[PDB]
Design a protein around this nucleic acid. Sequence first.
DNA 1: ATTTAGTTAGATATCTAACTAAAT
DNA 2: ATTTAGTTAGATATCTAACTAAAT
Lengths: 138, 138
Amino acid sequence: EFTYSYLFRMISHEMKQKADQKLEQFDITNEQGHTLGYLYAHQQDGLTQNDIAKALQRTGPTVSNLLRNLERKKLIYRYVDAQDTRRKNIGLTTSGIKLVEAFTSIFDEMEQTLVSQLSEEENEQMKANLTKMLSSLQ
Amino acid sequence: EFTYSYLFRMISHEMKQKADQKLEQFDITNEQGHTLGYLYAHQQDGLTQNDIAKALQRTGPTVSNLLRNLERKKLIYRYVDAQDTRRKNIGLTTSGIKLVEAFTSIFDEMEQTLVSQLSEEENEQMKANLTKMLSSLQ
DNA sequence: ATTTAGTTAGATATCTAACTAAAT
DNA sequence: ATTTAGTTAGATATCTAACTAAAT
């Protein structure tokens, strides 16, 4: 019986935490895992950073910064697109695809373990309640 | 239909942002708000930094860092505990107490604005399930 | 012995304000 | 001659590694 500030704060932090530990063996952070994971799914769209910035609900610098790390790992690649020299377009590298195929399990577990804690009727109402709340902030 | 991670992750983040913007009034960050708020509530006990870490579920360095930020602002003061010289007792300065008394509405404002989004039973379920999901992540 | 309490410093994530590089 | 894409400055928060100092 606590504050929503407390609850959402704690839960979120412990997911970054639990997931940071499991992701250790791949030398990435959860944020990095998620971005990588995102790129696995939607790179078909000739992705550019703003697009990612938009998808991750994070700022332009924040994303610039994360991508830079990932490219230092050579986990991704930014060809400076042709129509614009400003635009860098983002995609995985085999090494990054290999990585994604390899850690994706971790994310899936936590989800399942979570959605194991409840029954289908709950998860839909619960997850559908969550969505509603997120919007109100956003 | 979103993965739980996305939801907690996004929700907690914007809460920080909404809270952070509103607090801009007071020259403090969302976390500083929460820490001072705790200090205001439990100050009498009286807390060591490690007490704060446990309550806030944070590592020792992280608390050490925030407290210093709060100390710089002159909103808390700390001194060495006389019996156990290891410890530093943390307390709110008079300035800090007033500051809390000022900003507390915001935290309440946001908690309500969330609560106002569901039925009393829907909220009852919500907060209840969340505790369990929190628990399940240790 | 070993556990506790706190600091410091290098990473990453994040931010806003402000930059440069370059397309309109 | 002007937005617009991406980066940098420097701030907070967070973690671990590494430390010191102290208690049990």
